[PDB]
Design a protein around this ligand. Sequence first.
Ligand SMILES: O=C(O)CCCn1nc(C(F)(F)F)c2c1CCCCC2
Length: 134
Amino acid sequence: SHMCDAFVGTWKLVSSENFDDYMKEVGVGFATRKVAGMAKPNMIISVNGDVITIKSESTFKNTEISFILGQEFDEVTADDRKVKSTITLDGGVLVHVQKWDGKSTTIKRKREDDKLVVECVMKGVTSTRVYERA
Ligand SMILES: O=C(O)CCCn1nc(C(F)(F)F)c2c1CCCCC2
């Protein structure tokens, strides 16, 4: 209880850095990278008991995941990968690992001042996405 209080809310993307290169590293093709790179999603995070729900809504795609910390689940990503995901809390950071096709990427979400900072990492390539309260 209260495990993710400071994440809960409605958040809007305000800045992105290096996201094209992250998407390339992931294997996203040209047209999806261009279209997806324009999106300014709203991320809606809620908690009900042990179940955390993260919704992302944008002009590109709407996605939704619900999960229990430490318990693997199937996820269809915004770029249409079919991945196996596990999300844990490590020192106050939500750590989301996605596995598919022998590959792996990690998305970390943390609270920093009034922002929610999302770091997406694949091999040597990081992207930072900054969200503010909507
Ligand atoms: O939460 C975040 O800001 C970023 C992580 C999720 N996310 N959001 C989008 C986009 F561009 F469609 F919005 C994509 C991905 C997965 C990575 C592949 C590109 C599509």
